[PDB]
Amino acid sequence: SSQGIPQLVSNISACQVIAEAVRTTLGPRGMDKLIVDGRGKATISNDGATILKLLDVVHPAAKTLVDIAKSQDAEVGDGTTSVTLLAAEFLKQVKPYVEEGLHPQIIIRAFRTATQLAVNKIKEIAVTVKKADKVEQRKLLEKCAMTALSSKLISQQKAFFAKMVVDAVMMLDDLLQLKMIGIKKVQGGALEDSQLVAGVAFKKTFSYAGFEMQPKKYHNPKIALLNVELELKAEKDNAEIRVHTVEDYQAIVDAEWNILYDKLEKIHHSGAKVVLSKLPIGDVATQYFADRDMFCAGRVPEEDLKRTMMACGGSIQTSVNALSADVLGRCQVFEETQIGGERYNFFTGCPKAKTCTFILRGGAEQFMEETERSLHDAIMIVRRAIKNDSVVAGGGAIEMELSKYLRDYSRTIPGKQQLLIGAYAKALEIIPRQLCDNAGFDATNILNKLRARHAQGGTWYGVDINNEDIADNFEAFVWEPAMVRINALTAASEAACLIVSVDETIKNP
């Protein structure tokens, strides 16, 4: 490397390379990437935030871009791809100009003024319908989620999916990581029907006889949060006893199990009245728990424990300790409903209803995975939108609105900054271009008519991935929050200006 342009163009190339790790994953139907861990584990994730989190980045320019991407992930999470692509394309479109030899401080202040103007234009052109109280607006959020889900192309049950997810998120759910409000998918059954779980519970119970006669509908069960288990062959006593009678050998078989029997008796008498365990439990143990007039769930996932933390208000027990009801959580609903073939046990209704998860049953596998991503995206967008002051038309539209506005302002501003603002505006075109390319590779053909009709008159028109044709991205209920878009554009601008402000990289090994 060398001072000034020769190292800055290397930074340009590095930012292009780190873009290539995200370039094709922008759209919701964009290409997914398999990333292999050094342990030999194959992981699949089509969202740029997770990709960059798993991907190790070494080059300092890529390091800064990924750091800004992670800050945006902490901000929203989906904006990682957008901010990375904007930074990379800003750098790409200043590459011919910086290689020409103009000082990068010029483009620093050029981007600064351009993005301040862009923020002004966003705040001016953003519009609000909000007013979510009335039923019309409830079904407006419903049709928004429907447009997000449109890959399913189902009949009215499409709107039912949307209504269920919007209701689950609107019931007392604040802006959060959303991990507790997740979904599950089940084989068989009709996709027209599924369970609106009022909480979260265990995936599929076992074939034990205690399951069939399990005590459905606990009125207010106190819960026990265990991890240590009782099971066969796990432990034994190496005792030796000389014969005295025939009644004596039962001391050995007693010592093999007596501590376990007392342990289960006391931990069930602790004050809890339903018990969960992360490790497998024996059927014989289940029968003694039925002797305790009680039931146990083994092999529970750790996410069950975390959702119990944030929703059930419980606390970990993890062993026979804590023989008290004080540290135990509470539930308002419990049952078991074999969802088709899914032997799902239910314990739901919590001091905090932050999780009111859903379980899908549609008799397939290929649809409900992209369905998981689609519902994830829709339930995310509604909650981020309601918090923000205003919303703006997304999906490649507002990028073109800003591009047209900045082209018009660049072509009228004097001084060498106008070429730079024009380059900024052309670089801002990348999101429509990548949305089109990742969808049908017809980017130019649709982009030309899109820009032309956008310049024809004031509209929020953009690209529609559903039909590869221009659609009213606003009033087609595909949206991006205005405040989130300000955050994304400003973060991308700061990343780009910071990384193009640097001439040398310094090493002291």
């Binding site: 047209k404 072509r411 501003i413 004097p414 070429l419 030309n448 310049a455």
Partner: protein, 514 residues
């Protein structure tokens, strides 16, 4: 990829000529033959004398010289514009836009350029009625070398050229360069240069036994010749008779004296000696009696005959004469006066009736700055000839290019087809003439072209600033100048035709694919 190699070759041949664009353009080295190296900054010369082995450069330069020979100067602009649009179209092809798409786009952009230039930015041969100002600006910029004295050149040129009138198809008001005779002279104060509304020359003094010294109501168009040094040999060496080729020579001298007596009898006071007079005859006939002149310029002789409605070839078969001349050479100048003018013994003839021509005598000081003056006058007269003979003018410099670029970008944003980028990128590429002129003007192009774009946007978006449409740059300047107080101009016909040929060359060279 072979079309991309064509693109590289065209970019190379364009970069060869880029630095030569504009009057401030740098000179170029080019070696057609090992024996000599040529130093020229003229675009036509450098394109013609240079050749490039690559076929694409051959095609581009062949179209360039077609333009050069069929519509005049502008071939350097054609090469630069065509190859810049070529490289930019290659950039589009890398964007997976097929070559035929940018072909259609360039054709549509050329059509819209032809419509726009002829419609909105044009002058109706009147220079908006400010001819006595644009010329005043023009003389300033056509002649940097002169500097201080300035406006007097303009005030003479305007009427000295408007006094001309050629005859041609429907009688266009074209006023050629030769319509004015440049009389290099020096010795006096550098403050004036008397234009002769007509023509001027010098003749013998003392031997003026004829009324040319004073006001002549009527004049002649006659030639003249006197000889005693073997000018006319009616018999040749074919025989060796020792004393038989000297009496015909002397008798031809005597019959030439008879001829001039036949001429001086009719008078009419316009008598002009033709060429071939030996120096021995020149020193003889100043004493022996001659109504002669010191073999004044034969080009001036022809232009004088044209400026008098009578040429000696219409009555005589040659420029010497043995048959008696008819009265067709009876001239018709309104006024002929001899004066001790400009401290030299010139003859001054006013604007002769019928077909006429102009002239100037230089009131210069010393030889070399007056040579500079003789050069600046030629430049000013020729360029104003360009301006007026064009009979239609587009604002010169980068004004038309920047206006066309902004307008075509808007058109592309309002066209909507597969070649939508073609129009806009043609527009962006067409800024290369403002860019090249700014680079050659020792200025930063990113700022000058920027000001051009901003001015043209403000001019054609808000109609309140219609006059802001006429700012461009051609020469080293701190701020781009407007073409209404200033006067840098190019003929609209040659500019639009050069743009059309640049577009056509780009189309032809992109239609070659594999």
């Amino acid at each position: 990829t072979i079309r991309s190699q064509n693109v590289m070759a065209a970019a190379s041949i364009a970069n060869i000529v880029k630095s030569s664009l504009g009057p401030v353009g740098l000179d170029k080295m080019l070696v057609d033959d090992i024996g000599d190296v040529t130093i020229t900054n003229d675009g036509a010369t450098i394109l013609k004398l240079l050749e490039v082995e690559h076929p694409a450069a051959k095609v581009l330069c062949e179209l360039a010289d077609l333009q050069d020979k069929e519509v005049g100067d502008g071939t350097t602009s054609v090469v630069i514009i065509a190859a810049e649009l070529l490289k930019n179209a290659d950039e589009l092809v890398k964007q997976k836009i097929h070559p035929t798409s940018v072909i259609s786009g360039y054709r549509l952009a050329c059509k819209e350029a032809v419509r726009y230039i002829n419609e909105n930015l044009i002058v109706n041969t009147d220079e908006l009625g400010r001819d006595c100002l644009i010329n005043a600006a023009k003389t300033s910029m056509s002649s940097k070398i002169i500097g201080i004295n300035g406006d007097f050149f303009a005030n003479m040129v305007v009427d000295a050229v408007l006094a001309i009138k050629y005859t041609d198809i429907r009688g266009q008001p074209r006023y050629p360069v030769n319509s004015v005779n440049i009389l290099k002279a020096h010795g006096r104060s550098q403050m004036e240069s008397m234009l002769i509304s007509g023509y001027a020359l010098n003749c013998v003094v003392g031997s003026q036994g004829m009324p040319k010294r004073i006001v002549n109501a009527k004049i002649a168009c006659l030639d003249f010749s006197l000889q005693k040094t073997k000018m006319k040999l009616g018999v040749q060496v074919v025989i060796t008779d020792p004393e038989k080729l000297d009496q015909i020579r002397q008798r031809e001298s005597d019959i030439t004296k008879e001829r001039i007596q036949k001429i001086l009898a009719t008078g009419a006071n316009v008598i002009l000696t033709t060429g071939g007079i030996d120096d021995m005859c020149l020193k003889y006939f100043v004493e022996a009696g001659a109504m002669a002149v010191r073999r004044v310029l034969k080009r001036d002789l022809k232009r004088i005959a044209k400026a008098s409605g009578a040429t000696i070839l219409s009555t005589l078969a040659n420029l010497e004469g043995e048959e008696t001349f008819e009265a067709a050479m009876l001239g018709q100048a309104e006024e002929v006066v001899q004066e001790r003018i400009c401290d030299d013994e010139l003859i001054l003839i006013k604007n002769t009736k019928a077909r006429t021509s102009a002239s100037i005598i230089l009131r210069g000081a010393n030889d070399f700055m007056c040579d500079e003056m003789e050069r600046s006058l030629h430049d000013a007269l020729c360029v104003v000839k360009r301006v007026l003979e064009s009979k239609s003018v587009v604002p010169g410099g980068g004004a038309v290019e920047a206006a066309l670029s902004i307008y075509l970008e808007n058109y592309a944003t309002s066209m909507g087809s597969r070649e939508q980028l073609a129009i806009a990128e043609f527009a962006r590429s067409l800024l290369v003439i403002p860019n090249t002129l700014a680079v050659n003007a020792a200025q930063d192009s990113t700022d000058l072209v920027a000001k051009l774009r901003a001015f043209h946007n403000e001019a054609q978006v808000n109609p309140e600033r219609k006059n802001l449409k006429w700012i461009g740059l051609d020469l080293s300047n701190g701020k781009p100048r407007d073409n209404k107080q200033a006067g840098v101009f190019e003929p609209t016909i040659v500019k639009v035709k050069s743009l059309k040929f640049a577009t056509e060359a780009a189309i032809t060279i992109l239609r070659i694919d594999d």
